[model samples]
Target: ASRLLLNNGAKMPILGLGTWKSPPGQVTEAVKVAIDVGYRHIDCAHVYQNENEVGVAIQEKLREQVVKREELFIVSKLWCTYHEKGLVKGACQKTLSDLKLDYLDLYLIHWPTGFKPGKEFFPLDESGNVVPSDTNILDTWAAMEELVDEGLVKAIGISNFNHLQVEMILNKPGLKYKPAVNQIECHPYLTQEKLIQYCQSKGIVVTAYSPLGSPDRPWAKPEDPSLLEDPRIKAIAAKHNKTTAQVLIRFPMQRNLVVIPKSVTPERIAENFKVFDFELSSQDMTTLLSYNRNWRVCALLSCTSHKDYPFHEEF
Candidate 1:
């Protein structure tokens, strides 16, 4: 299995299991199946609320010696509610307890927004206001640094954050640790080339989420075109004698960015893990890069007032 070395000199598998939209019941079986099929990295979060189920598989794999603890690169996120002054450590500690591990290979702020206690994970009120609290992400990032000091997380990063958001955090004082990764919604359609380049310049690893273009996701209304079904991707899949899903996985891995594609079926889990065995041609890579439609599936328009809110305006 190929791996990418973090700025801190830690090795993380280039491919991994993604737990988003994975039901609680399916996550455990998926984790077990994924590890059995050869995945050494797992992306999870408390908002997914499936870590307990994921934890079961983590413990089982340990008991069976499927992979040593040191060999697995486990990642999770801190929720917005925990962004307060004193809640960060407890939130991460809870994740450690649920994961039944002393240290998380990487931890991230699930999103840039912060919320008060008792808000639903989505943070929308009955009137549909996407309330933004006064908490700044830098405040949370500082606490995350403290977490590294306390030995709860090996490295820290951010997710669903823009270039400006990362810049703000990176500028904070007394910051001995720079982010090791930036997990975001990415695929050929939403390649985010400039942001990826900026992170690369700073030595922050990029982790692509929704790499398969999230066709099975329920958020897209009916008749919304699916990226995996696009003729170009299908053509590449045909040329390589691989499924479109496999081609998508191969694209990001070849670029040295970590990829996490989620699937619940045993056969799909096995298939998704085999991308490392093959490589995409330079022509195919160029074609995939040109397919950048700026189509993002996770549009959080409700959270921002920027006129360019991904949902309200064209990307």
Candidate 2:
């Protein structure tokens, strides 16, 4: 597997298995299989509620000496529940304990969307019991930065942050640590060229998720068109004798960005991790990058359309 060395001097695998919807029941086997197949990076989060299962698989691998702890890159997120100043440390420590790992390779603030205790999502009324006057992420970020000083996390970053949010955090006073990386929804449809380029210029690595356009997402609406089905991606895939995902994975890596493609099935896991075996020509990559549709699979701002809403406007 190829590697992208982080600014902190940690080597991150270019390709890894993403465990987004990898529920507790299957996450163990999925992690075990991913490790067995030579995957050294695995992305997880506290919100996924599967750290125990993921931990179990990692434990099994460690017990067998399939890989050393230092050889693997593990990632987790600080969920919305712990964004509060009071709950931050305990919440992160809970995930660390559940994951059964001494430290994390990369720890991220899951979302810019913050919430109050016991609140499922944000509420409409500012004065609502669950609503707080301020959801400023910088406060939570300060706590996150302190984690590095405390030696609880190796490095810290964020996800789902728009350019403005990143700028806000970067502009904070006494901000000793800038976010090392930012993981966002990046695919052919949602190319996010500016965001990716910005991170690169800042010496911050960018990781793309849903690279195959999310074919296996359980909550994906049936009406939404699949990027794989689009004639543009199909033609490019055909030109290279590769699947849409193969093309997707190759496209970002060629651009020198790290990408994590999610899958739990054995065949799909192996297939996603096999992008290192080949390379795409410059022409193919140019064509693939030109097909951005500005589409996003998980529209957090649009999540309000559900019965129990989060926010009223696009945030």
Candidate 3:
């Protein structure tokens, strides 16, 4: 597994196992299998609601001497509800406890918007929409910087932020630490060329989430676009003697970005991590880039009314 050096001089694995929708009962074993298969990075989140199980697996592996805490790079996100300046530390504390770890290698702001602080992940109003909070992004970022100052997190970054918001952070006067990485939904169907180029040019690595088009996304429809089954990609995969999923995962890697493809199946987990065996040719990369239709899988459309909706802007 190759590691990319962050702007802060901390290195993170270029490939990681994503646990976004890994169910409670299965994630523990899924994580255990991932570790056994030589995965060094584990991407987690407070909103995913399965950190305890992930913690269990991590601890078990450490106990058996299968892997060491220092050898693995663990990443988690601060949820929208915990975006207030005063509330950031406690939220990170909870994740630290749930993950059963002393410090996170990387911590990210899950979204640019803030929601009402509460137990409910999505606090709702009478109209059945997400209640909003007005925590300024820079305010939350100031607190994120403190996490590094206190050693609670080694590095901090943002997810789901558009180029404008990203620029605002970069141009902020007297910025201490720039974003380490920007995690976003990326794949062949929705190839994020401009954003990847921008972030990398600025020394911020980008992590591609849902690299297989999120086949199991909650809102997936039969008529929806499928990256896994797309014949164009399948043809390339066939030529290379690879799976379409492998090609999708490598697409981001060849672009010099990180990719965290989520899965709970043992074979698929191993298969996804085995992408180092082959390389996608230059023409193959060009064809995949040309297949871009700006099709997004994780549109986050439910919170469009929020003042910080990111996808509405051109990347």
Best lDDT goes to which candidate?
3
What TM-score would candidate 1 get against the native?
0.95
Deviation in Å, model 3, residue 238 alpha carbon: 0.8
Candidate 2 C-alpha error for residue 238, in Å: 3.2
> Which tens-of-lDDT digit does each residue in 1-315 have in candidate 1?
489888778998999999888898888999999999889999999988888899999999999988899989999999877888688999999999998999999999988778656647767778676765667777788889999998889999998778877787788887779999999888988888888888888889999999988877767876876777888899989987899999999999877799999988889999998786689999988889998877778866567763212233221
Order the numbered candidates by lDDT, best leading: 3, 1, 2
- Tens digit per residue, CA lDDT, model 3, 129-227: 789897978889989999999999999999999999999888877788898999998888888888888888888999999899889889899998898
Task: Pick the TM-score winner.
Answer: 3
Model 3 lDDT vs. the true structure?
A: 0.92
lDDT of 3 at 214: 88
Assess every candidate by TM-score: 0.95, 0.90, 0.98
RMSD of each: 2.2, 3.7, 1.0
Model 2 agreement with the true structure over 1-315: per-residue lDDT tens digits: 399878788888888789888878988998999999989999998877789999999999999999999999999998765777777788778888998988888899887766655645444454343343245688989989888988888889988877777878889999988888888888877788888777788888889888888877766887887887888888877876778777788888888888888887887787777777778887777777787777767755433333223223232
With candidate 3 superimposed using the best TM-score fit, by how many Å does residue 228's alpha carbon deviate from the native?
0.4
